[PDB]
Amino acid sequence: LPGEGTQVHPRAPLLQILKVAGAQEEVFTVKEVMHYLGQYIMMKQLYDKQRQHIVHCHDDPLGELLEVGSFSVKNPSPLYEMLKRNLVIL
């Protein structure tokens, strides 16, 4: 994934999710994309209630993009691989 200044354009399925989280933009930095994904998970309360570094996305559109039912915020590989599939580097 690109550095802090480089801009990316999210593919439609990801952009849709960022929109739900309140994103108005169509072009982002990776950090901004990550901000809105965190907002999304928080709003939808997808994190495990007791162990909150675990996210359960099996019955959510986010899980369709990540292709996994759960992941750990401390093992973000699945997130980064999803972004590689869903970000156009500008």
UniProtKB/Swiss-Prot annotation:
Q: Which cell locations does it reside in?
A: Nucleus
Q: Which residues form the SWIB/MDM2 domain?
A: 6-89
Give the family per the record. Answer: Belongs to the MDM2/MDM4 family.
Q: What does this protein do?
A: Inhibits p53- and p73-mediated cell cycle arrest and apoptosis by binding its transcriptional activation domain.
Quaternary structure and partners? Binds to p73. Interacts directly with p53.
Q: What is this protein called?
A: Protein Mdm4
Task: Print the organism lineage.
Answer: Eukaryota, Metazoa, Chordata, Craniata, Vertebrata
> Per UniProt, what is the name of the gene that codes for the protein in this document?
mdm4
**Covered residues, full protein:** 17 to 106 of 496
